[PDB]
Design a protein around this nucleic acid. Sequence first.
DNA 1: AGCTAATAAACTAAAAACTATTATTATG
DNA 2: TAATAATAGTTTTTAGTTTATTGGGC
Lengths: 705, 489
Amino acid sequence: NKAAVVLCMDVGFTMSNSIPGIESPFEQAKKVITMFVQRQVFAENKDEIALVLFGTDGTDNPLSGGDQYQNITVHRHLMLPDFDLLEDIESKIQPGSQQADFLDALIVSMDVIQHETIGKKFEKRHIEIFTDLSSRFSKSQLDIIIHSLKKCDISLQFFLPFSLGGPFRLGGHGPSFPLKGITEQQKEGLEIVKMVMISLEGEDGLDEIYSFSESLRKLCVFKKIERHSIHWPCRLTIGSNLSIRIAAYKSILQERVKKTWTVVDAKTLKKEDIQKETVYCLNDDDETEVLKEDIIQGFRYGSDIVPFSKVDEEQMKYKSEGKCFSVLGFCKSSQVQRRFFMGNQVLKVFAARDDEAAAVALSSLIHALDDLDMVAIVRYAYDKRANPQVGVAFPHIKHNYECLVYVQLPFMEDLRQYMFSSLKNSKKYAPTEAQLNAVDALIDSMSLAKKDEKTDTLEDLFPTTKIPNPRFQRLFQCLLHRALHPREPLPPIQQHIWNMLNPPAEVTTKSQIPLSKIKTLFPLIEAKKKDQVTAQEIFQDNHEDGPTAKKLKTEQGGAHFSVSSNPAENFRVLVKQKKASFEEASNQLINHIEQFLDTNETPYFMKSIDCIRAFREEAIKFSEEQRFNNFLKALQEKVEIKQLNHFWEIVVQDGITLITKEEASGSSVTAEEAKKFLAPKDKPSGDTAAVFEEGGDVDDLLDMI
Amino acid sequence: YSGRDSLIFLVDASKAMFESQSEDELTPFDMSIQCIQSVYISKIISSDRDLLAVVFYGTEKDKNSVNFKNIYVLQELDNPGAKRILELDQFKGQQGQKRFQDMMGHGSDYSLSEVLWVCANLFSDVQFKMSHKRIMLFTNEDNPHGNDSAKASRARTKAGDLRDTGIFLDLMHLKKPGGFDISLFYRDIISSKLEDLLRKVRAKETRKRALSRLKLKLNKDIVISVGIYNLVQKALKPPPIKLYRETNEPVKTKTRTFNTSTGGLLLPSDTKRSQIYGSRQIILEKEETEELKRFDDPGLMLMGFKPLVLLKKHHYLRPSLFVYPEESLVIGSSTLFSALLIKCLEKEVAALCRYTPRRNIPPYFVALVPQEEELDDQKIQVTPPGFQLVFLPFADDKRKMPFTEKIMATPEQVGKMKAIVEKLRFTYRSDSFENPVLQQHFRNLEALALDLMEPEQAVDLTLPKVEAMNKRLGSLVDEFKELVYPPDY
DNA sequence: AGCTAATAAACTAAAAACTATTATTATG
DNA sequence: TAATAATAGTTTTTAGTTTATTGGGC
């Protein structure tokens, strides 16, 4: 296929004016068009391109044309697209600060395309334009543009941020897109363009009106440049009076690359050191290279490999008899099995062209088994280059000429016989209304057809057959990723592939409502070894961070090591350790102070009071004067509640002889030092009339009173 | 499935075989030789992972492992082997009858007691994996019990005993076939088809243990183990096996990309793939290439549900693939789907998901139909009720509609070819054909053991005939001509 | 009257399923 | 003291490249 294309691009911030969650149509269009170019070049397709811009800061179009061609920068000319050009498209084409009429740029396009159609071989003329409708419109050029598309007959395509045919989506419907709630120049440009383009393409117009997000996901330009089915010279013969020539066409294929990953070394980056050499030694204990022509190609027969030549098998083999096609069997359409199929391709067959009689016969023949609901079994011997194919041909319905499609049908050899018990009679498990509802809750919540009316035929709200193999553009992503950036590693995750394939979020959230209770209804258990193997990306969350120890450059980091593997030193080293939050080793060591104060030995309590009276400076110098005063008030009462004449008397003795208080939490300690004395003791109480214990009490109270 | 079946042909050593037995056709001696070889050959191409042998109970010259009288072992318990066919070919005809006289003679008494016992010993000998066991026996009489009942008692007693052992039996009518004639010692516990035995199977290699299992999921929260089986595929060819010029053994295949730089060696690490794109050299490694082949992990995210509006008569990718809920590791698979198998006739809104065979494979949007039952008359539940995951086309897969696009033509021709269409018809026997091209090769291949140009060239009712079924439908089709000027020249 | 092009078949490696096995720890 | 258990060993597909090839010309 051949085509003529001129790239009419936009440049302008208003034409990049957008909202978060929705990409700039400038960038959306660019991604679609570099898609066009990468498919144009990577797949080795030949076309003549040309770049023209509107709203350009300045103009390059030589044709002033009454200053209607201002802000028009002509960039590219007739040459095959190249990677540097597309790199320029990515780089140079950035939204400027100028707006020019899109229709003026339309006159630019006809002018250059008519310049480029002078003696240049082209099988198609197409125009490519995209604008988010933030440029001035016009009407004086309506006649010339109409006559250009009518006489010079140049096809065109465009899309908008509005689709004609909720949640923010890069490719799906984000916020509602009202083309009436926009500024009127957009709508006027919208109205003028649509009446023009429904005038040119007829009814090929309303279909190509998408939001820029929708074109970013699904087919926008793919269809304009698409490969048509190729004729197959064939003939249908029935009986001995009538035989009609037919043309067959394939419908399904496995997409694949004609090219290969050419082997080059990493040191020379060329094929010139990878020269082929495949050698065959006698596989005995002694290796012995055998000459290739000495080959014998036998086949395994039972446990034996009976030696076979090739020319023999080349002779007594059997083959299909020619490029022939004729029906063999018949039965009704109901006998076919949805499961009993082969045919990796799908083939559609029609009459030989330039012969309406054969088409009439096929159209007539279609009617019969259509009104008869009949199916015919047509033998398929496409040529001698393979064995004959076999299967049933079924009619194809269409708003115009119908079709028949041959499908391969299973052989006995290719049929599996794996038989299994029916779960309906599975005594072990029965469907419960709980799981029934669980099933039903997603049956009705989830569907992907559009259901509002009977007269409105149900259609895929999120079409899936309109999405090609994701690998190819993903290939194209890295190809340009390395081509433009030889040093850059792999292309990023690039969410947009998921987003073109992500389910409708509103439907997904609508799924989230029942599936939650459905899951929780019947959770299930699983066995182990259900995980990937390696994870060695890097040795940690990251390689490393750069902090380091400083502020201790004394030349004695060690070599005088502070050896460390609570009478006075353990507590003192603990308070010297007041470097981490200052709140530890003091709130809980007072118990040690108590049991060290047990007065069992004189040094016990003396070294006890030294530790406290040494602690008092620490908390002053370790900012713990608040707890210091707290403990000051605490200790006195704590030693007086358990009162014995041995310790506390000495305790206050030593205390009041060397009590030192400096303002901590205010005058609290100042009051503490201002008042440190004793209290008089009163007579003990008796008053014990509950038991006979007063007996000995009264005995004492009367012996000596 | 692990397990090996065994079938053994049991033949007698007495007169009855060499005499045609009240039938003008070939003797039971002759017809057996032909039939057993034919079914021998079928089993050979059926499998080599199978044990075969034949023995002649009775003899005039002892020839077995255990050396019991009236026992003639002719075939050791063997896998199929071309030399065996080589030695079996020459039993045919009167010359083979002469050999039978040479090898043993003709005629010797018998005692089924020892016969049956030593046969079990034969099966006790083999230690291979054991799936099934059966015996093909041949006789012309309806009863060997024209003598003391002790043999008859011993025979039938252990006939049940080997039934407890589990050997299925089938006596063939070597006398008048059918006719309700041969039933005297066999209407008992003892357990026509002869041509259908020969015409039972041809050019098939039975497989088992279907591959390609994976786990499904509902939401990203839960995944369920399920075994996906394959129903059908394309016809494969046997792997050609290289052989030496005349010693005829394979030797190594050794690809070794030599270098023009030094004549030295290359490393796979040194290999990094290249795309020659004009001046734009593209150099990528294999694993980064292989990673580029991946988009997502092996899995099935359920898209949702979809009514019976799809299956446009334009698209069919590779054939769909059977799904069965298997308790592989997810404890509980079919218990969930106990409510969907019933929810098939009562619910036609289908479901779809993309599918990833494994990493390095693109995700494949694929639609599913849950599967129904067609349990046959004798409980034959072919296609157990599971699920059938059909593929769906991609945008790049769809082809352009033909540009010539107009309205259809008159039904006046429908009147003429009514008579054509309802005249000749077939039964849509989906089991009426194989690949004749392929089996012919097999016939060609093995023909180099019997020195015959090509054996049993079969082209069944699969090619139309320019005159046979033309006139079977009748020349009325020749009469029906209403489109003037057949454009052909 | 000189000229060649998509292509299934053929040819590969590639990953796998299912078998069938073997270190591995309680146990003494 | 010694049962248990992740494990690779054979094929089987399957898909990517390789091939020799009628097709029309003028």
